Design a binder for this molecule. Structure first.
Ligand SMILES: *C(=O)CCCC[C@@H]1SC[C@@H]2NC(=O)N[C@@H]21
Ligand SMILES: *C(=O)CCCC[C@@H]1SC[C@@H]2NC(=O)N[C@@H]21
Lengths: 74, 542, 87, 542
């Protein structure tokens, strides 16, 4: 899909955005790191395009919470 | 323009376009990659240093003992291995670092005994050699355990056993932990008799002394060799015969080579020295009427891995940390299997347990590797894959980096225990050879689901960064602090630090190795080689 | 027959058996205990609502027989033994 | 005051307090109960009437044929069964109503052949007897199918086969559906040879004629009997020999008893009449060196059901209706098993598939019965129960009243197809004897999950109210109307009525029975008895 509205897998804390806001990311490319149960889980981009984050870093998310939008830049 | 090719074209394609080839290039410029490489290099250097100091000896007492051993015309245990095996051939020494810091005040090098799989006349055999320079070769509890482990491996793989005997006997200081039990000194003779009854050849070469129970080792073997000067066999030693009948006899005139080779008939071959003894051992192995191969097919048309194993450590994070980072185990698999080819079984279902097919030097192997937290779906996928490999007689390779299952009311309600049980049952009841390697951490019931020590893998090895415990160190600290209501708020950090230190100490690779919980610690870059040897050892299994 | 608690590795004992019985009040089966689930997800759950007899006998399917008390559990055990087709 | 008793006290308790006793008293005053009773009574009366008119004959042509048969000194087929079996013993006649309305213009009573399991000298045998009063005994396609089914049952239960042969041969009008195929007339000889090779005795008694292919039946049997006057065996009949060589010979001088018993050697025993032939058959059975019982244990200490089977029909609703009511199948089970005792397997998990253990005259049986729509949980429970019974060599009893699985996006996403497949695999791959009875409706893949005809049950019976179809009549009507966009709104009711009538006609018990889709139609109150006989027939299986 050209939008790629991915949801969080489980409640946890977003620790670090591995890519800056507005950066082009390929498929399967890490965009942010989610920490839960003292384990680092890394969220990957599902398609090529500019990634814009929705949730602020160093915060907390819930089950099936939207994280970022991957818009295919022309 | 649509459907122009044939799938065989993609099957036989360069590595760039072949679709079942794992592509995980090393990010050598990444600082985390460099830090991981430095950590792995330090760990592997420490491992090699420990092995080298075991081989060469460190303290002056070791030097004195080796000087006494050499002055008797005896070869050192590793030298005996070198001169017994074929001159240019691999040797899979199993428990190199057994007995390390196990008994305070004693440097029990190798556990007092060297066990390995060698090649004699092109046939793989299990060699068990006593080290007379470790407390005179007396059997510690770890020595008995290692000898039994070697016998178990040989019996389940139908490897002929060669026992190079030079041992005073069981040490009387710890006789409670050595003599009486099922898994104790008599189990050696039980295993020897049962292996001999099954047609697995048992060969004994008496390079030194064997007293009391140890005297059964030459007598219960199919063929035995005794060296003239240093070989003595008797149930009752000279001290015992003097304390009983008041007679003084030297060991040579009591149980020397002449009495046991010309009159008693206990031994079958008279050896003038160690070299002649090893020659006679090779001659005995040569006359085992064992066929070279059931199937003359070779199938050695394999391609080496497309990525260098030397950078595997770059992908391995720090297992001991407050928050442990995750990595893709496929990057490891790409550096271990033939042509970096890997047919993944359920790529989109498990997503935390990677199951697939690969080849090691042309030998087809099913690989089950951990890639995160175990779920019900991952356990079901693993069980189905294990059943699939069992129905095809495909050997299994487990790569353990596991930190338990997923907790929660929803997951228990979904039956996660039932699915974990399905995986455990599939692993336990299969008959294909299983080899497991702890690359990360093995914690709790997840270990049980991934073919741990209790589930009878043919071999089990640990990387120097691996940790094995009932639970993770951070998890143990948090759970113990939360449960212990007696603990005061002022004494929380000290308690957590103490329990973390205890778990780090008792979970280290060396702690596990010294207790025969694994079959040795190996470097990641050697992993592929080790696997190949292990697989070959299983080719003679029924 | 789960007369009491079975936690973590012990939870494999009921699940790997051919037939299993769990007692209502005192029977609990879970791989992760309430302390572990609280330390992981920050949620508080009682052992009964985590791995009690109702969840493992009506929804999970881990257990096969629902026992009201110890005596009923032993009766169900005897009934299971009675139906082994052993000559 | 707490825990005063012992569980054995509850195990040995009166029916009021014994906890594993099903308590389903009949609500005899309920109008629905009376309506159900009236429907079941009418259906059972019709069944008995059809069986009786088959036995006694209805039309005048049947009377003429029977008069011709009797005037030849021949016994009727049911009379032959009565005088061949032990005088007071059960006989399980299988396809009583085969061939009913199957071929237009022909009243193919019993399919032209009577097959059953009888008791001769205390040994259970399979008896196959041709009915010479049905088109001269010529083999219809249904006749071949029924003969093959009897041979299959006998082979899989190791029942000795007795063939009472009186048949003109395959009918040339339908030779395309009789002669050439795998499941055709030659398969009879294939089965006979293979059973003889397995040590299962094959006995042939030629009460009448056997021409062309049928002549192989006496010749391929271990022992054969031919009656003097009426017995003739030849590959080529008198018409064929006259059309070939221009010679006229009577059947007696061509293949009579004298030529085949004194010169040819095809037959082994010379019978003066039908009674002598049956005596010789009994003598042959007497000299089969078959042990009376592998284990002399009896275990006949059983209690009859605590509720009368005669009221089972009260609980059975109208299967053919716009909305079909549901009932508890346990009320049926309470009227079929010993002491109305039933140990339910997962009482709270499946909730639509009742799985449990029971006993029929002391024989332990696992019962799987439908109690609503199949779900993933019910399919998993059924598969687990079937595996449990297979590991214990416990025979399985299926009670089918099934209307497919649960539909929906959530259920497919949960893997309902996978769980149904698990159930189907467990049913298919088990080796314990399986007996299935259609008490309600068997529709679609649910039938497959409940040991249908395609999954090799030892026996399969249908109640007179049962319906079997690829889908329910109402479901078929609704789905076909919705899918068919060509159909106009003005022609909806007629189309639905037509498809409902077609499904009712082709799903009735008699339609299934005439096509050998089952092993006969039985009344509910006889069900227990039938099961017992079937179970006994499986006691000689390997
Ligand atoms: C802190 O270290 C404790 C957090 C919980 C550890 C997690 S919960 C999910 C995994 N299963 C398990 O046993 N441990 C892991
Ligand atoms: C009307 O008669 C059609 C309604 C659907 C029939 C139901 S849906 C669930 C069951 N599965 C199946 O195949 N038929 C049943």
């Amino acid at each position: 899909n050209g939008s790629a509205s991915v949801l969080s897998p489980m409640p946890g804390k977003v620790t670090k955005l591995l890519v800056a806001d507005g950066t082009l990311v390929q498929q399967g490319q890490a965009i942010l790191i989610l920490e839960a149960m003292k384990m680092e889980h890394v969220v990957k981009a599902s398609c090529d395009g500019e990634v814009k984050f929705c949730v602020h870093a160093d915060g907390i998310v819930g089950g099936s919470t939207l994280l970022a939008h991957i818009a295919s830049a022309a | 323009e649509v459907y122009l090719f044939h799938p065989a074209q993609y099957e036989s394609a360069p590595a760039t376009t072949r679709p079942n080839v794992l592509h995980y290039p090393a990010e050598s410029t990444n600082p985390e990659f460099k830090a991981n490489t430095e950590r792995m290099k330090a760990l592997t250097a420490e491992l090699r240093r420990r092995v080298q100091v075991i081989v060469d000896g460190d303290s002056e007492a070791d030097k004195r003992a080796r000087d006494r051993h050499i002055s008797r015309g005896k070869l050192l245990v590793h030298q005996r291995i070198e001169k017994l095996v074929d001159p240019m051939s691999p040797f899979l020494e199993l428990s190199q670092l057994a007995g390390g810091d196990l008994y305070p005040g004693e440097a029990c090098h190798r556990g007092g005994i060297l066990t390995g799989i060698g090649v004699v006349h092109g046939m793989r055999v299990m060699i068990v050699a006593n080290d007379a320079t470790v407390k005179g070769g007396t059997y510690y509890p770890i020595t008995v355990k290692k000898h039994l482990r070697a016998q178990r491996i040989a019996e389940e793989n139908r490897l002929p056993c060669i026992y190079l005997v030079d041992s005073g006997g069981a040490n009387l200081g710890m006789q409670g932990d050595v003599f009486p039990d099922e898994q104790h000194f008599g189990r050696i003779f039980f295993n020897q008799a049962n292996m001999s009854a099954k047609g697995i050849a048992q060969i004994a070469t008496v390079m030194g002394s064997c007293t009391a129970g140890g005297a059964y080792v030459p007598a219960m073997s199919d063929e035995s060799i005794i060296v003239k000067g240093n070989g003595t066999i008797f149930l009752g030693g000279p001290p015992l015969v003097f304390a009983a009948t008041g007679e003084e006899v030297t060991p040579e005139e009591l149980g020397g080579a002449d009495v046991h080779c010309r009159a008693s008939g206990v031994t079958d071959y008279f050896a003038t020295d160690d070299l002649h003894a090893l020659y006679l051992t090779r001659r005995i192995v040569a006359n085992l009427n064992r066929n070279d191969c059931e199937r003359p097919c070779r199938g050695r048309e394999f391609t080496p891995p497309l990525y260098d194993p030397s950078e595997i450590g770059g992908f391995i994070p720090d297992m001991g940390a407050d928050v442990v980072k995750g990595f893709d185990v496929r990057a490891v698999i790409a550096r271990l299997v033939d042509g970096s080819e890997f047919d993944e079984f359920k790529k989109l279902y498990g997503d935390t347990l990677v199951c697939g097919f690969a080849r090691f030097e042309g030998m087809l192997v099913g690989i089950v590797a951990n890639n995160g937290i175990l779920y019900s779906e991952s356990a079901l996928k693993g069980a189905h894959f294990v059943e699939l490999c069992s129905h095809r007689n495909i050997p299994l390779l487990f790569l353990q980096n596991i930190t338990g299952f997923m907790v929660g009311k929803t997951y228990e309600e979904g039956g996660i225990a039932k699915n974990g049980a399905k995986l455990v049952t599939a692993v336990s009841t299969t008959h294909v050879p299983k080899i497991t390697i702890i690359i990360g951490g093995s914690y709790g019931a997840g270990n049980y689901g991934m073919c741990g020590r209790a589930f009878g893998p043919r071999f089990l090895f640990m990387w120097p960064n691996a940790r094995i415990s009932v639970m993770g160190g951070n998890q143990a600290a948090t759970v113990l602090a939360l449960t212990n209501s007696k603990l005061r708020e002022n004494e929380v950090q000290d308690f957590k630090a103490k329990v973390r230190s205890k778990y780090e100490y008792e979970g280290s690779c060396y702690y596990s190795t010294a207790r025969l919980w694994d079959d040795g610690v190996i470097a990641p870059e050697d992993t592929r080689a080790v696997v190949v040897q292990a697989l070959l050892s299983t080719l003679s299994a029924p």
